[PDB]
Amino acid sequence: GPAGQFIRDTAPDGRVYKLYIPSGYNGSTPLPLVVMLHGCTQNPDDFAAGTEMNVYAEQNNFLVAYPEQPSSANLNKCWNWFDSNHQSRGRGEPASIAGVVEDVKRNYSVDSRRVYAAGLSAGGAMSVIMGATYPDVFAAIGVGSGLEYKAATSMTSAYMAMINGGPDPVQQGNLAYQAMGSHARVVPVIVFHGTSDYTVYPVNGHQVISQWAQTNDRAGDGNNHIDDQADVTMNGSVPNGRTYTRYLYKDQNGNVVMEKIMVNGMGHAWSGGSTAGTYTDPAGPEASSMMWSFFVNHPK
Ligand SMILES: [Mg+2]
């Protein structure tokens, strides 16, 4: 019944983005902001339609921003996760996506401690980049079928990384830690990946976890050890849908810092969701709900 609004705006740098404002928004309470980064060939409306994130935003009283990657910036409307120009704080797409957050913060009441970045495919890899470059902004990140930080640094090596994974995740985790500069802090990460993904092969999902284990272990230095050994593993089952395995990674303090959901026989797709959007597998577990719960329990 209660209905919010889905607006389109342009940030000062020309970045188009859409923003879902829930019906419960009255400006008296700073709301969480989930930045949702669409995959290749997608656009904000398609990603909203498939992830259903505006329904969760309506139900949970949070804001959702969908930055748009236009065809003028990448041939396939992919976030340029493989390009050195778009892997560092302060310039390129990381700066532009941070700019969208700043634009929303200026126009609505946003909870600075509950700003998150999630995405599918190239947008999952970009969400990794956002955590490494703007950890002062993003409390936690969700990586749907993505790749580790700097899995490739030119377009020439991007395809190999999609198929075979990036370099040694411990090394890439050091680079992500370096990319954080003086803003370094633990960034909790939830990863989703389908075991029959023929686009971004699941080795990449494993690498994201291993890379962030190192980065988050390093961000704790200068007390709290984090490794890529799963502390709790459980099989789950979707009624009349897919099975999946959940891996939980704790730090020494006992906090869940990372989570990995491998959906058995899923392809390259957002897990769960609706056929109203492209690149969804309605028979998977509901990544949007799972990711939102991970986010809300991992404020900055
Ligand atoms: Mg552990």
Author numbering: 1 to 222, 225 to 302
Task: Provide excerpts from the study.
Recently, a promiscuous PHBase from the thermophilic soil bacterium Lihuaxuella thermophila (LtPHBase) was identified. LtPHBase can accommodate many substrates, including PHB granules and films and PHB block copolymers, as well as the unrelated polymers polylactic acid (PLA) and polycaprolactone (PCL). LtPHBase belongs to the secreted subfamily of PHBases, which most likely function to scavenge hydroxybutyrate (HB) from a few environmental biopolyester polymers.
To test the hypothesis that LtPHBase might adopt different active-site loop conformations in the absence of bound ligands, we identified new crystallization conditions that do not include IPA and we used PEG 400 as the cryoprotectant instead of EG. The overall root-mean-squared deviation (r.m.s.d.) is 0.2 Å, indicating a high level of agreement between the two structures. The two most notable differences are distal from the active site. Firstly, the loop comprising residues 221–225 is disordered in apo LtPHBase, whereas in the IPA/EG-bound structure the loop was readily modeled. Secondly, the five N-terminal residues adopt different conformations. These changes in the structure can be attributed to differences in crystal contacts and suggest flexibility in these regions. Slight changes in the surface helix (residues 155–164) appear to be primarily responsible for this difference. Most notably, in the apo structure Met155 is oriented towards Phe81 and away from the Tyr159 side chain, which itself is in a new orientation compared with IPA/EG-bound LtPHBase. LtPHBase is likely to prefer lower-molecular-mass, non-film polymers due to the apparent lack of conformational access to the catalytic triad, as seen in our apo structure.
